[PDB]
Structure formats: C-alpha cells, structure tokens
Amino acid sequence: NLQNIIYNPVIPFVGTIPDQLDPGTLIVIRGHVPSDADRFQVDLQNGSSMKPRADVAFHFNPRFKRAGCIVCNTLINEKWGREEITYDTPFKREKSFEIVIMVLKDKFQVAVNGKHTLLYGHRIGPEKIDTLGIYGKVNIHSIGFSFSSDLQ
Ligand code: NA
C-alpha cells in the first residue's frame, strides 16, 4: 500500500520525496481540476529553491486551453529543454484524476486514470531528484509513495 501520504495540501506544494527515486518507485497523486483551470504542473526537482530556481528533472504540465495537452520538459540551470507534448489528454476541468508516476531505469512512465499516458526519458539522473513540487490550478486530494524499502 502507499505510504508517506499527504492529505489536502496547500498549493503550491513543495515537499521532500521520502526516499531515493530508484526504479519501481511510484508517486501517486489524486486530485481534481477546478472549473477555472488553465494549467497545472507536477515537477520532480533537484532542490526546493524558487529563486534561483531548482532544476526540474521531470516537468509534467497538463494545459487546458482549446483541446488541451500535456507538456513534458526538463529545466536545467533555469533553461527549459525541448518540449515533449502528448496531445490526447485525459484531464478535464471539474473532473477528478489519479496520476501514477513510475520511475524506470531509463525513463519515467505515467498512467492517468488507470491507463498508460506517456513515457519521458531521463535527462537528469533520477538519483538527483529530492523534491516534489505541485503548482498551478489544481486541487490535490492526496499524495502517496511506494518505495522498495517500505515496511508493512
Ligand atoms: Na514553470
């Protein structure tokens, strides 16, 4: 089962991820998109500073204008790289969602609402990730984690 759970956080949320992001690690984020949303993002970061801004290994950015999309990217030394855009977005204003990010050796895999959504190859070594940030127009119900070290 998921552990290290956070309930109903204030957004923006910035929290230390409780263990290393080894292959098989799961980050599970349940929430809903508010009626007025333009975009939100989930960022897996190397550090927590907002200024100068911490590197973002994996930026997962649902956008809601027109037909919507999900933009993924990486921020290194305050510069964004090439966007990878997934156009068939499952997210909808006023609807709840579950995001499951799984770390693999060479990429992240993301499923939304129980269906595979996208892959994103590592551009920063995942061992450098220590922080989860959630920003923008989104209402988070819970955040939970699964690590290979979890006891039960
Ligand atoms: Na940003």
CB 77 within 8 A of CB 55: yes
We find that the CATH architecture of domain 1-152 is Sandwich (2.60)
> Is 30 a known ligand-binding residue?
no
Strands 79-80 and 69-76: antiparallel
Residue 73, strand partner residues: 59
What distance in angstroms lies between residue 91's CA and the mean position of ligand 1's atoms? 19
> Is 63 a known ligand-binding residue?
yes
> Is 53 a known ligand-binding residue?
no
Experimental method: X-ray
**Consecutive H or E run containing 124:** none
What distance in angstroms lies between residue 68's CA and the mean position of ligand 1's atoms? 17
Cα(first)–Cα(last) distance of the chain, in Å? Answer: 8
Resolution (A): 1.1
Fill in the amino acid letter for 136. G
CB 59 within 8 A of CB 75: yes
What distance in angstroms lies between residue 60's CA and the mean position of ligand 1's atoms? 10
